[PDB]
Amino acid sequence: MGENQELVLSDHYISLKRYLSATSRDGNPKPPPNKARDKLQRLTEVQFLELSTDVYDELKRREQVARRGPNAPPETAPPDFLLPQDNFHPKRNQARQKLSSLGPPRFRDLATDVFCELERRYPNFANLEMPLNAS
Secondary structure: OOOOHHHHHHHHHHHHHHHHHHHOOOOOOOOOOOOOOOHHHOOOHHHHHHHHHHHHHHHHHHHHHHHOOOOOOHHHOOOOOOOOOOOOOHHHHHHHHHHHHOOHHHHHHHHHHHHHHHHHHOHHHHHOOOOOOOO
């Protein structure tokens, strides 16, 4: 254990890589035809972390939904969007709702942009490590 924002983004990076890998063979290193990393530079690091967290949170919520997809009762069926809470600011809640509203292609692009940004910003993320699946 330790305290490092890089480690937090490392988990996000790994999660994004697995997410992208699970949704794409990754035969194209640059999926989008257009790029604009300068757009992501129009925000602060904290805002960037907030966006990274929002993306991460969206990813885990979708995974939970998928897990509770088949062979799951409707009583414990999760929402198709993040429900608002007073613990979180309403603007942030709306932002999260927008992520849910966005379909997979747009979201995938967001994931790709964040993933690429993290890889470019942290070149050492290209030399982290990945887990293995076994059953």
